[PDB]
């Protein structure tokens, strides 16, 4: 059932990307209005695994006042907020990016840029959309800006060169000669990309390892005969494998991925009475062994210029809110927290890697962060059992 990786994405009528819509008929329009009088910012600061950023604009004929700086955005991009210098995006250090400019639709013009995770540096580029020319009822129009920060992938990127083509754009690879009996077993750390190159792969490639249990990549991205396996951020067992197969050169080259080290010390609180849990938490305070008249409060403080670790919470009661997808606010000395915010907006860092588990009745919720937090933040989660409550407060610098 060998099919090309590009053919393993099926078909979807949606977009599945970073849509930054700016069109008069759209919700986030730019024509003058009395409800809103401020510009629109579409900020995307994160690493892209062959991901797409789209910049929908109105047609020139329909809205001649609308202008875009640079006019050929995603082909030439601004480099400074204040200097306003436009540079070709081919000289920005980008690797294997591409651009598409679709004008067939009679309502809007689409401008997509596809970006690869192989960049050797942290790139930043803007694209401004000026609509101040359009004035209606003596009211000036609003502007907009798309800011894109392509962060260099903060982990080692690996490559299997199993195709006849030469990939000079990225030189760290294993190539065909490193295979023993057409079987490769690579030991990777957490968050370690494996960009395998193969024209023909298995239909269920990187989804079912040869025995040794099985684990799931957070992403399996197929693009242009490239299969990207993103190594999981947190693992619990050692006997773990994932298998892929190729028929290149009339040989069934097998690839086996397996992490080697397990069970980081999770910076969290262990409210469960279980002392034999497969997880290892920094703190510990039983909630079932404390009496009803006691409020449990534990704090996890983290301080590092760069983060690679996690924050977790294991408890046998119910967890409020649905941590760690949503969290509370720092409401201390006033009342018990009752407002719900998203963790992604609470910490102001993208691509946070969540995790959930149910060890018997013990609900365990974790989120791991890689990178640098802009500003120091704090948040709380509550675990309630019967009438007793435990407040875990994370303070991340």
């Amino acid at each position: 059932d060998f099919c090309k990786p590009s053919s393993l994405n099926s078909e979807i009528s949606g977009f599945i990307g970073y849509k930054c819509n700016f069109s008069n008929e759209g919700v986030h329009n730019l024509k003058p209005d009395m409800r809103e009088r401020r510009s629109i910012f579409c900020t995307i600061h994160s690493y892209f695994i062959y991901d797409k950023i789209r910049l929908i604009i109105p047609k020139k004929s329909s809205s001649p006042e609308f202008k875009i700086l640079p006019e050929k955005c995603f082909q030439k991009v601004y480099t400074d907020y204040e200097n306003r210098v436009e540079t070709d995006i081919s000289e920005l250090g980008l690797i294997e990016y591409e651009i598409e400019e679709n004008d067939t639709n009679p309502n809007y013009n689409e401008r997509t840029i596809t970006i690869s995770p192989f960049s050797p540096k942290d790139i930043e580029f803007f694209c401004f959309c000026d609509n101040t020319e359009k004035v209606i009822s003596s009211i000036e129009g609003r502007s907009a800006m798309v800011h894109v920060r392509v962060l260099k992938y903060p982990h080692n990127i690996l490559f299997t060169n199993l195709t006849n083509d030469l990939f000079t754009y990225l030189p760290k690879t294993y190539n065909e000669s490193n295979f023993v009996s057409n079987v490769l077993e690579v030991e990777l750390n957490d968050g370690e990309l494996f960009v395998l190159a193969c024209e023909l792969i298995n239909k269920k490639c990187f989804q079912e390892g040869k025995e040794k249990a099985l684990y799931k990549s957070n992403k399996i991205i197929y693009h242009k005969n490239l299969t990207i396996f993103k190594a999981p951020f947190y693992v619990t067992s050692k006997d773990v494998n994932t298998e892929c197969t190729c028929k290149f050169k009339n040989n069934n080259y097998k690839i086996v991925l397996k992490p080697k080290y397990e069970k980081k010390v999770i910076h969290g609180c262990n409210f469960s009475s279980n002392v034999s849990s497969k997880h290892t938490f920094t703190d510990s305070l039983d909630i079932s062994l404390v009496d009803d008249s006691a409020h449990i409060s534990c704090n996890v403080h983290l301080s590092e210029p760069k983060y690679n670790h996690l924050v977790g919470l294991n408890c046998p009661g119910d967890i409020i809110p649905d941590c760690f997808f949503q969290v509370y606010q720092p409401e201390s000395e006033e009342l018990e927290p009752s407002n719900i915010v998203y963790l992604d907006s609470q910490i102001n860092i993208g691509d946070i890697e969540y995790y959930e588990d149910a060890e018997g009745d013990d609900k365990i919720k974790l989120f791991g962060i890689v990178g640098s937090i802009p500003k120091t933040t704090s948040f709380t989660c509550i675990c309630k059992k019967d009438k007793k409550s435990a407040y875990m407060t994370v303070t991340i610098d």
Partner: antibody
Framework: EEQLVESGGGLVKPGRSLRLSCSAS????????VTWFRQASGKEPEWVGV??????????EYAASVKGRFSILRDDSKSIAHLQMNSLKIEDTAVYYC????????????????????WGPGTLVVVSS | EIVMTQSPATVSVSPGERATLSCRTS??????LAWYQQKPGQAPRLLIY???TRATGIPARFSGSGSGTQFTLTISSLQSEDFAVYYC??????????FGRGTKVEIK
């Protein structure tokens, strides 16, 4: 509705000079590279000429069969394209279209692909005796 | 440049029955194909781009599929207005201005 209309075709004796004109209604032709195709005797359209965007210099390209005679001109101010024909041979009798590259896509190596969306009705040009 | 081959040149099918047209490309083009439909007496129009996406104002019966070197345009429940000639052009690598041999759909 955005569309293209062309004129200038007709009957002309061999060895003369002709001028096909194309115009765009409903949009501007300055952002698209005009590609003049031709179709003869119910065949597939055959590339005759290409004139590129102002941003890409303004280079002109032609097929081998017509290289050195046909000359493409553009006027973004009036958004009109012209194909000037010198010393037409007998084989130039065909219907000519002026397509625009509605879909474009590039990469790190420069321009990579064009796909044409809007076609004019096409001007018939006949040369014989 | 690349050359696309279409076989058969003429396709015969009764109205209300799907017909399949195939376009084979000598080199690798990935998923950058364009299918154009030309009814007699007027210019061809862009029917499908990207080998799977339908152009605006196109009924859903025109389905596109394929990738790499082989592509297919399936016309499902063919009506009386879907008789024309179809051209496949590759626009992945320079130059894009190259159409196919043309395939005709007739009434059985």
């Amino acid at each position: 509705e955005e569309q293209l209309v062309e004129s200038g075709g007709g009957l002309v004796k061999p060895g003369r000079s002709l001028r096909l004109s194309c115009s765009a209604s409903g949009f501007t032709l300055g952002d698209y590279a005009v590609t003049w195709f031709r179709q003869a005797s119910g065949k597939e359209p055959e590339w005759v000429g290409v004139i590129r965007t102002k941003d890409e210099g303004g280079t002109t390209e032609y097929a081998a069969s017509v290289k050195g005679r046909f000359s493409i001109l553009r006027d973004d101010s009036k958004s009109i394209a012209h194909l000037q024909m010198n010393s037409l041979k007998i084989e130039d009798t065909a219907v000519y279209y002026c397509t625009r590259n509605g879909l474009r896509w590039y990469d790190s190596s420069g321009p990579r692909g064009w796909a044409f969306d809007i076609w004019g009705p096409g001007t018939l040009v006949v040369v014989s005796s | 440049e690349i050359v696309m081959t279409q076989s058969p040149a003429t396709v015969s099918v009764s109205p209300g029955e799907r017909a399949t047209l195939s376009c084979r490309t000598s080199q690798s083009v990935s998923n950058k194909l364009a299918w154009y439909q030309q009814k007699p007496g007027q210019a061809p129009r862009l029917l499908i781009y990207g080998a799977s996406t339908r152009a605006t104002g196109i009924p859903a019966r025109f389905s596109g599929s394929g990738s790499g070197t082989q592509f297919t345009l399936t016309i499902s429940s063919l009506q009386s207005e879907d008789f024309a000639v179809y051209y496949c052009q590759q626009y992945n690598n320079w130059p894009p201005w190259t159409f196919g041999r043309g395939t005709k759909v007739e009434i059985k």
